[PDB]
Short mmCIF file of C-alpha atoms in Angstrom, two decimals:
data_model
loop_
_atom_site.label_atom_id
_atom_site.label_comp_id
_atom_site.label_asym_id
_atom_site.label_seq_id
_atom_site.Cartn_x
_atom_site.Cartn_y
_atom_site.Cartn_z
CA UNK E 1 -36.78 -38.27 35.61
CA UNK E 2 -37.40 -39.08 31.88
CA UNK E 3 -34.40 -39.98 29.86
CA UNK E 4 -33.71 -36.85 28.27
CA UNK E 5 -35.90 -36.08 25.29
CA UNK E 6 -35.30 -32.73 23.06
CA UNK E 7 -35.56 -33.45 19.70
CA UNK E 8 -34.27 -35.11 16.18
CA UNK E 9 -32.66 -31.48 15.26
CA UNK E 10 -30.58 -29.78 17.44
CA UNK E 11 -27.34 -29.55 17.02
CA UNK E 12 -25.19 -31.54 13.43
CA UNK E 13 -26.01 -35.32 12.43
CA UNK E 14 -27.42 -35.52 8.80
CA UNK E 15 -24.16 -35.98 6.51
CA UNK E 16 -22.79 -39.62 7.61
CA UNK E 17 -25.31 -40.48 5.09
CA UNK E 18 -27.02 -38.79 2.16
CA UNK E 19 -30.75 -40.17 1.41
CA UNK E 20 -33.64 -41.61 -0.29
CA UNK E 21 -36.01 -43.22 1.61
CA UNK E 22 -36.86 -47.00 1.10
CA UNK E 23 -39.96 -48.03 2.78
CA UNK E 24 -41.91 -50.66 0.02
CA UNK E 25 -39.09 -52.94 1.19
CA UNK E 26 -38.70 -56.66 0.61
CA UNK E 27 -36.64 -57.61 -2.26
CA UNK E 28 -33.08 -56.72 -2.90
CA UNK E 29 -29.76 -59.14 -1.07
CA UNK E 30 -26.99 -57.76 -3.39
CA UNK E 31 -28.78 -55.95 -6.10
CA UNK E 32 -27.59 -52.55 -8.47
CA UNK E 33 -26.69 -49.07 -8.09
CA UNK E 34 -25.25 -47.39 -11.37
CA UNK E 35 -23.60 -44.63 -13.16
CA UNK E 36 -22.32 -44.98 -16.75
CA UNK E 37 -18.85 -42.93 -16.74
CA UNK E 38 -15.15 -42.86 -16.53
CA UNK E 39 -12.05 -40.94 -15.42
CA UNK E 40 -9.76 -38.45 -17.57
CA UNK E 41 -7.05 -39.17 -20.60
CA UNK E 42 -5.75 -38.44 -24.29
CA UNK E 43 -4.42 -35.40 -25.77
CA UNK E 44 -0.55 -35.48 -24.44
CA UNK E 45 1.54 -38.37 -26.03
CA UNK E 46 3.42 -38.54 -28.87
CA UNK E 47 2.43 -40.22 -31.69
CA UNK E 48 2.34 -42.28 -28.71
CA UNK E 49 2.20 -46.34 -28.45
CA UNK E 50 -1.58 -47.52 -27.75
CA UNK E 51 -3.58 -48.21 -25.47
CA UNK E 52 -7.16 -49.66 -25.42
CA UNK E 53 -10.60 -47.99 -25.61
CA UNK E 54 -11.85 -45.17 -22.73
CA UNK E 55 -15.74 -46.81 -22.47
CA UNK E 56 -16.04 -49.21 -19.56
CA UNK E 57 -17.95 -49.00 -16.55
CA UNK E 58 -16.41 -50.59 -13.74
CA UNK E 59 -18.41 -52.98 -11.09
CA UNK E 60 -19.35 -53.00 -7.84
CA UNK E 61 -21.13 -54.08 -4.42
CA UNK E 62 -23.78 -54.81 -1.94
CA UNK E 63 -24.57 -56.00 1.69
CA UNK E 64 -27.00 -57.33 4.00
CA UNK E 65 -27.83 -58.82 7.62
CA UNK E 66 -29.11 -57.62 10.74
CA UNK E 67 -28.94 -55.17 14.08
CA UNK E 68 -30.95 -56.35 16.68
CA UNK E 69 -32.26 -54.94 20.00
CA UNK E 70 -35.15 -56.41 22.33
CA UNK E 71 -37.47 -55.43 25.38
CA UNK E 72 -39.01 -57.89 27.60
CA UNK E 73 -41.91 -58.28 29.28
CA UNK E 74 -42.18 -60.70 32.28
CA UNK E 75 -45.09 -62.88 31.89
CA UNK E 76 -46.16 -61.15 35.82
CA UNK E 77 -46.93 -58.47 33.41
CA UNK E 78 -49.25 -58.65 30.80
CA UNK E 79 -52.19 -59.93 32.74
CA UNK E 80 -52.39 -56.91 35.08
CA UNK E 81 -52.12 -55.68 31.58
CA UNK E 82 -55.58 -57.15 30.53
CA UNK E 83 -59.28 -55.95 31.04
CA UNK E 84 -62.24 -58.00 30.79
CA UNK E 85 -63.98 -54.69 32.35
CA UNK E 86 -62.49 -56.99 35.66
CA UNK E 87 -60.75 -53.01 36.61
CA UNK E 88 -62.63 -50.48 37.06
CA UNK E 89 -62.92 -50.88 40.69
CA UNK E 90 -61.20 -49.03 43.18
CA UNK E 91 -57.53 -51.37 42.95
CA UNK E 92 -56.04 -50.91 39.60
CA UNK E 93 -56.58 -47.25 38.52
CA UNK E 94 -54.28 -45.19 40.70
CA UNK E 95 -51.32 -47.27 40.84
CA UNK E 96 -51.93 -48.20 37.59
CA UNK E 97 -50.58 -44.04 37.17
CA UNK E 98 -47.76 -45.03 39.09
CA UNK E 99 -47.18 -47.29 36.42
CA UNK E 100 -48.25 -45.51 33.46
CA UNK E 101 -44.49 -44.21 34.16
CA UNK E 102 -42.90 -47.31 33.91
CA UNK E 103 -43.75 -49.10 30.79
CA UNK E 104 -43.65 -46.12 28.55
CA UNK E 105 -39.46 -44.99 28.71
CA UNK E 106 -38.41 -48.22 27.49
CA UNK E 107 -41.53 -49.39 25.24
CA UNK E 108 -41.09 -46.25 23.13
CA UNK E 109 -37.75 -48.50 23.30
CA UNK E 110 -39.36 -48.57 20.33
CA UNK E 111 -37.98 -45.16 19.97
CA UNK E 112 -34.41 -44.98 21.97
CA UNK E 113 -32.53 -48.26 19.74
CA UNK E 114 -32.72 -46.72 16.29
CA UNK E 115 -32.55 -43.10 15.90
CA UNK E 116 -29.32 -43.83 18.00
CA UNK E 117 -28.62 -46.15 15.88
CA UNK E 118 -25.56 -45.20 14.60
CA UNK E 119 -22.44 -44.48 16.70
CA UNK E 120 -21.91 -48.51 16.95
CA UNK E 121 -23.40 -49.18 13.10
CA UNK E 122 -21.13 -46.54 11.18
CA UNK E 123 -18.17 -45.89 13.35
CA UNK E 124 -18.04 -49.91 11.29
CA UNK E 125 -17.39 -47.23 8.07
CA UNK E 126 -14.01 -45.73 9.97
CA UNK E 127 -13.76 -49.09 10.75
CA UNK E 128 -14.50 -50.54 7.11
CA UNK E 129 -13.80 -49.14 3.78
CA UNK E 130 -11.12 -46.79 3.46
CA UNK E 131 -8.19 -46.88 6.46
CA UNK E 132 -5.64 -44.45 7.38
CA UNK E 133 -2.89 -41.64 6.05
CA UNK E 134 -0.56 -44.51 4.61
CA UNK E 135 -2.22 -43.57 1.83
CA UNK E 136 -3.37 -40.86 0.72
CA UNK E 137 -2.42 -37.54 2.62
CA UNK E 138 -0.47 -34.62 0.73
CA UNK E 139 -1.43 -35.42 -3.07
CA UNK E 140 -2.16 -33.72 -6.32
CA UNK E 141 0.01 -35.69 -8.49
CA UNK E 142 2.35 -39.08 -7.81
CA UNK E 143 -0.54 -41.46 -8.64
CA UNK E 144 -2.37 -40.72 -12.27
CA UNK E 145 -0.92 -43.51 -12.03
CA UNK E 146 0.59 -47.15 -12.40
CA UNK E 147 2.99 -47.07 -15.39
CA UNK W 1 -16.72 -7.99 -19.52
CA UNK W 2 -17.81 -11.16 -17.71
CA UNK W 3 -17.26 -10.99 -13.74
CA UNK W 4 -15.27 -13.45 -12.06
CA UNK W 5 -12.34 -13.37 -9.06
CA UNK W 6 -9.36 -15.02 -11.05
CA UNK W 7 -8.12 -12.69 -8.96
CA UNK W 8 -5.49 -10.17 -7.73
CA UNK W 9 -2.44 -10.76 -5.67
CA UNK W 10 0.53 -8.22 -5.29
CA UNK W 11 4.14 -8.08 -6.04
CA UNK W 12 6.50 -4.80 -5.52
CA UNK W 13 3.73 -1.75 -5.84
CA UNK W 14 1.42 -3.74 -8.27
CA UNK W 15 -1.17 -6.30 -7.97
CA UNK W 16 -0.22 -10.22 -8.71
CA UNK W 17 -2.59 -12.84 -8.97
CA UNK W 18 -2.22 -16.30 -7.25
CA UNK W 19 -5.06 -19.48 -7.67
CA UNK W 20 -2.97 -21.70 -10.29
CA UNK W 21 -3.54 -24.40 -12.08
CA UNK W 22 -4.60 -27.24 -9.86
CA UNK W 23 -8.34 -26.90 -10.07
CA UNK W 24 -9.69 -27.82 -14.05
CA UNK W 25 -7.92 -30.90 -15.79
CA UNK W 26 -7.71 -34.66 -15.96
CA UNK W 27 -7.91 -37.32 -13.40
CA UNK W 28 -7.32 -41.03 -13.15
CA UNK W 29 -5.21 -42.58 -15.98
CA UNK W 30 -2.39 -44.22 -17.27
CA UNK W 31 0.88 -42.34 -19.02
CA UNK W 32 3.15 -39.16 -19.03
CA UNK W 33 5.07 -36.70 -20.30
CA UNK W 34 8.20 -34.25 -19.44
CA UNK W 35 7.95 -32.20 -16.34
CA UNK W 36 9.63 -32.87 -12.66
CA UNK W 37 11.96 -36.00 -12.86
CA UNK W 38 15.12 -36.08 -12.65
CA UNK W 39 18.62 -34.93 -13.41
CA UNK W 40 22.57 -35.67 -13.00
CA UNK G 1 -29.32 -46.09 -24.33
CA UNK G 2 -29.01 -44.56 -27.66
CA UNK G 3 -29.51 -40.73 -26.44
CA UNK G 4 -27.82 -40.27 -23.39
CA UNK G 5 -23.98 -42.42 -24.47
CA UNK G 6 -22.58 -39.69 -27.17
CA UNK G 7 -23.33 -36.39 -25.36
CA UNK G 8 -20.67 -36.62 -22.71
CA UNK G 9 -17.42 -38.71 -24.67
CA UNK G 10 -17.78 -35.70 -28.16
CA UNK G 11 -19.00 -32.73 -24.96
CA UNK G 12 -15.74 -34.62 -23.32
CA UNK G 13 -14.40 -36.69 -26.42
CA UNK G 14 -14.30 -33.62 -28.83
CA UNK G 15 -12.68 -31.51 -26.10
CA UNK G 16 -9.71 -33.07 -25.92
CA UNK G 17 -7.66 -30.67 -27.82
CA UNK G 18 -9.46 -28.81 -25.74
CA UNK G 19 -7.10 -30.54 -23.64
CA UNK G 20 -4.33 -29.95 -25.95
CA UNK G 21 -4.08 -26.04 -26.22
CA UNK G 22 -1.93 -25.44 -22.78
CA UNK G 23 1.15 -28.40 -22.40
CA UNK G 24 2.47 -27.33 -26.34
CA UNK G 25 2.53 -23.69 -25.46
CA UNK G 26 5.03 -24.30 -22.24
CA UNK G 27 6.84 -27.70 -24.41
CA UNK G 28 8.88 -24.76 -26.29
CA UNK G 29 7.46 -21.85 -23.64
CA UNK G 30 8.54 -24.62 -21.11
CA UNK G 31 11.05 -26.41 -24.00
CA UNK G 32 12.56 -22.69 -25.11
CA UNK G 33 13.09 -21.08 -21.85
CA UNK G 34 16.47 -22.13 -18.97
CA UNK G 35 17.46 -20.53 -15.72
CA UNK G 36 17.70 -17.60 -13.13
CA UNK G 37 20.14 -16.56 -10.98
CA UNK G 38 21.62 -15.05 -14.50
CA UNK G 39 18.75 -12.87 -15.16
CA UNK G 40 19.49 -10.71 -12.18
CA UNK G 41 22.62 -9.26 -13.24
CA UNK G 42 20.82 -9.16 -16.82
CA UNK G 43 20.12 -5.83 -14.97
CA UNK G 44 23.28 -5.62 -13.33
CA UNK G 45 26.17 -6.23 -15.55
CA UNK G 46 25.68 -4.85 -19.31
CA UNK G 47 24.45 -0.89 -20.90
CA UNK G 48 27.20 0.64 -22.84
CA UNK G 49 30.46 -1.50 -22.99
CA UNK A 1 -19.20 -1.34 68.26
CA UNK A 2 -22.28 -3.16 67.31
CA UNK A 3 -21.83 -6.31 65.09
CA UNK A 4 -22.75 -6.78 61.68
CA UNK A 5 -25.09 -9.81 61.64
CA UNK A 6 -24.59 -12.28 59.07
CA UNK A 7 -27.60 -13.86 56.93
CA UNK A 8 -27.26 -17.28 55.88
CA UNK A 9 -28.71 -16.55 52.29
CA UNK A 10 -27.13 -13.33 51.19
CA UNK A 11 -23.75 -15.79 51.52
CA UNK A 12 -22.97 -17.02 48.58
CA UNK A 13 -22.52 -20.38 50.06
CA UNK A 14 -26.30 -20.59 49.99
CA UNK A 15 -26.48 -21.65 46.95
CA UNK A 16 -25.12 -25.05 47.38
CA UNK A 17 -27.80 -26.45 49.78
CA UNK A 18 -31.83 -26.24 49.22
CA UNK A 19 -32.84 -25.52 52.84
CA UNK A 20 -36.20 -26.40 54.38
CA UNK A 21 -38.24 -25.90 57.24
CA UNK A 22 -39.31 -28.64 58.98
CA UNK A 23 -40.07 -28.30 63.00
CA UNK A 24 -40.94 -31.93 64.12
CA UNK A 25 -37.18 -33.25 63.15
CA UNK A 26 -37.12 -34.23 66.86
CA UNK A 27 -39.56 -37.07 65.41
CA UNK A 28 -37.45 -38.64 62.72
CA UNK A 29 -35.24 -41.67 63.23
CA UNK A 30 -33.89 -42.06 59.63
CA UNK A 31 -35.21 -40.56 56.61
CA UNK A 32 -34.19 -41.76 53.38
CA UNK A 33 -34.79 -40.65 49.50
CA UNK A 34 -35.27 -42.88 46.34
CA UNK A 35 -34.21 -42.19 42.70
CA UNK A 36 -35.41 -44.10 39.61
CA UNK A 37 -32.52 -43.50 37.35
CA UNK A 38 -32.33 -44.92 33.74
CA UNK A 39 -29.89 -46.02 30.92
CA UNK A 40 -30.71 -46.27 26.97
CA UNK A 41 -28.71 -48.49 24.82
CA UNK A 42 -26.34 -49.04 21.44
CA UNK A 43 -25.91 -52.31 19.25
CA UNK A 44 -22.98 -54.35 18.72
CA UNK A 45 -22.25 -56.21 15.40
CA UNK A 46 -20.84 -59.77 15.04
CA UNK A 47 -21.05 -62.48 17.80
CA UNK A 48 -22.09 -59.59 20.57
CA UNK A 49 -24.97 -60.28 22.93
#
């Protein structure tokens, strides 16, 4: 067997997100992300009462932290895993085929815990910022609004 | 003559037209005006 | 910060009339105009009399 | 009458076992077969190990 590998594009995943990429890393916790606009108003009133300018540009938010995921090694195993031209010599090459199987499905670990990375990560977003119907279902028109 | 469906519904023998004003103006503020509400 | 801030509040704040050319045509066409079931017989009840 | 004779592989049946030829079964006390069967993994946020 080898866990089952055809690849990155075939069949719907790319619109959880949008992108840009983001690889110079190291420096940001809780840093910016802008626009500089606001939402519709003023020409039905009466010679109404006031209100109080149109121009702000509201605030907003950042996070951080983690998502973790190891592989490991017994200390048995590194050893056999060096040289010093000591192999070469007719026990370590044909087994070590044998082997060439195991360490290389869950090494390339290093490819199986992120680009499945997120079915635990953002099922936290339909956990996390905007919750169910009790809002917002049937709309068009009861919330302008406030007053 | 600029091309565009606005376009044609039907009502009788005729045509009629039907995509109505929900789709152009104003979001996302705070007063009103005459309308729905209501009546005794 | 001086170029970009007055093209879209005069392109949207000097269209506001241009939202203000459709709610006073139906405030008297929708403030000069009552109800229905007395059109119908406005074709059934009244040619010659 | 003579009888139709049956053949194991035009049955449709067949297609449910992989049949193979092997004459010195007298000679077996118990074979056995191995599988080296995997799972990948997911994260969990918060306190999970």
């Amino acid at each position: 067997n080898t866990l089952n590998f055809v690849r990155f594009l075939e069949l719907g995943l790319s619109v959880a997100c949008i992108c840009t990429k983001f690889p110079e890393l190291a420096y940001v916790r809780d840093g910016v992300i802008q626009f500089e606009v606001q939402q519709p108003m003023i020409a039905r009133d009466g010679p109404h009462p006031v209100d109080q300018p149109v121009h702000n540009y509201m605030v907003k938010r950042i996070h951080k932290r983690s998502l973790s995921a190891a592989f490991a090694i017994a200390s048995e195993a590194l050893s056999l895993l060096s040289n010093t031209y000591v192999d070469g010599t007719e026990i370590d090459s044909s087994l070590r085929i044998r082997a060439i199987q195991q360490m290389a499905r869950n090494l390339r670990t290093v490819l199986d815990s992120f680009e499945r990375g997120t079915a635990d990560q953002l099922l936290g977003v339909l956990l996390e910022k905007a919750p169910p119907l009790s809002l917002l279902s049937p709309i068009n028109k009861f919330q302008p609004e406030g007053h | 003559n600029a091309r565009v469906p606005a376009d044609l519904v039907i009502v009788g023998d005729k045509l009629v037209f039907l995509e109505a004003l929900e789709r152009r103006v104003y979001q996302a503020t705070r007063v009103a005006y005459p309308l729905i509400g209501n009546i005794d | 910060r001086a170029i970009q801030q007055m093209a879209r509040n005069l392109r949207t704040v000097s269209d506001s009339f241009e939202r203000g050319t459709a709610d006073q045509l139906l405030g008297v066409l929708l403030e000069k105009a009552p109800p229905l079931s007395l059109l119908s017989p406005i074709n059934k009840f009244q040619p010659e009399g």
